[PDB]
Amino acid sequence: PDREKALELAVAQIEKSYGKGSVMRLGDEARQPISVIPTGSIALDVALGIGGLPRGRVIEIYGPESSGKTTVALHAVANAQAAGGVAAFIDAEHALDPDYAKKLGVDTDSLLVSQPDTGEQALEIADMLIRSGALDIVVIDSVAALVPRAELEGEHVGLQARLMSQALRKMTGALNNSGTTAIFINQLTGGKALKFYASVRMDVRRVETLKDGTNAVGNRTRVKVVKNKCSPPFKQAEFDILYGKGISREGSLIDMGVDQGLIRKSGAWFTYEGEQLGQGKENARNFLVENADVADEIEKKIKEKLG
């Protein structure tokens, strides 16, 4: 009785003293922003609570090599562009495949790219772009590769950590004011600092390879939102990344649809409102890409049932 009031107080003073999202019950409904960058999987967008990535914030996406972490970020880039935004890609891996990026939906032509010489240059260039106020998103690929100038020049170990800590302090304020999202891709360095400056942290893994008739048409991907200052954390989603196509938006609509009851199962058949989507997931997936209207209708309904 008198308990709940004092707790309401404690929480309010906490949010007041350290920002909204400094504490929350895991069963809470997220505080929903107006603009947000969708990820490409509605399932992941739901996992993130707020229907996508937050603006003006630091995001980390980490995983092993061949996990999908980069793919996820490229969709972030693509959706940001699709809403008339401007994207940058600070690159210290030299790994990007623009053809893949296009098929996925990236306007590579408009994509700003820098291939910096040093870790500090990478972050400084990134900061200059952020401070312009013209960017909707900037991706840093990747943390591990951000070698410090002293180490590249020959010359004080644990410097990477000092570099990042310094840079992220300055970068955090710039992002908040610009409304620009910074995504830092990270391999399994200066990830110690990024762990705490980041508003969202996503652990990305590939779990099993999707079997075609006889060959492999991509693989099933699992993402755990390990840190989330924007909505109850620890949520996780799965979705399909398809060889040379990207994240199966339609596949994820089907998954979240059945999970949400909007799509029932007449055995193998997937049914929507008494109409049949397809026999087995591959047909149901196909049907929804052939029919944008029904896919959009489902995506519309899933969101309505949630936020």
Side-chain angles (χ1 to χ4, degrees), residues 24-30 32 49-50 230-232 306-307:
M24 43 198 171
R25 298 175 160 82
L26 297 172
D28 288 347
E29 285 173 332
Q32 284 278 329
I50 72 183
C230 301
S231 172
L306 295 168

Side-chain angles (χ1 to χ4, degrees), residues 229-242 244 246-263 267-274 276-280 283-297:
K229 305 306 295 297
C230 301
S231 172
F234 310 131
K235 294 280 166 189
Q236 65 179 49
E238 294 179 359
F239 52 86
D240 299 342
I241 307 179
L242 300 172
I247 289 172
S248 173
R249 178 202 166 200
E250 294 84 6
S252 219
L253 291 169
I254 293 161
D255 293 348
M256 282 305 300
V258 18
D259 191 71
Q260 223 50 217
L262 298 177
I263 309 183
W269 290 91
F270 291 95
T271 87
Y272 176 64
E273 282 189 310
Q276 67 191 36
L277 299 185
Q279 193 198 336
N283 287 311
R285 178 194 273 115
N286 269 248
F287 183 74
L288 299 174
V289 61
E290 287 167 289
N291 302 119
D293 53 308
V294 62
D296 297 13
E297 230 263 285

Side-chain angles (χ1 to χ4, degrees), residues 32 73 112 119 121 124 134 224 307:
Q32 284 278 329
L112 288 170
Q121 175 168 332
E124 276 148 30
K224 192 185 181 191

Side-chain angles (χ1 to χ4, degrees), residues 165 167-168 171-191 193-210 213-242 244 246-263 267-274 276-280 283-291:
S165 289
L168 287 189
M171 189 169 297
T172 275
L175 291 161
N176 297 353
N177 302 336
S178 68
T180 300
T181 309
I183 305 187
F184 286 85
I185 300 167
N186 202 340
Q187 200 106 311
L188 306 171
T189 62
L194 181 60
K195 189 177 178 181
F196 297 90
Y197 278 105
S199 314
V200 175
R201 294 188 84 224
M202 299 199 292
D203 184 344
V204 183
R205 261 61 133 73
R206 87 166 149 73
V207 289
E208 68 178 296
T209 143
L210 296 166
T214 60
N215 204 28
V217 70
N219 38 218
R220 176 135 273 240
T221 296
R222 179 179 299 159
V223 181
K224 192 185 181 191
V225 184
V226 309
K227 192 193 181 160
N228 196 348
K229 305 306 295 297
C230 301
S231 172
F234 310 131
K235 294 280 166 189
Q236 65 179 49
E238 294 179 359
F239 52 86
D240 299 342
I241 307 179
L242 300 172
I247 289 172
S248 173
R249 178 202 166 200
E250 294 84 6
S252 219
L253 291 169
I254 293 161
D255 293 348
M256 282 305 300
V258 18
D259 191 71
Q260 223 50 217
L262 298 177
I263 309 183
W269 290 91
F270 291 95
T271 87
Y272 176 64
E273 282 189 310
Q276 67 191 36
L277 299 185
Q279 193 198 336
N283 287 311
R285 178 194 273 115
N286 269 248
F287 183 74
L288 299 174
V289 61
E290 287 167 289
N291 302 119

Side-chain angles (χ1 to χ4, degrees), residues 37 53-57 59 136-139 175 179-183:
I37 305 165
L53 296 172
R55 287 171 167 284
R57 298 294 193 275
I59 282 67
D136 280 8
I137 186 163
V138 58
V139 180
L175 291 161
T180 300
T181 309
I183 305 187

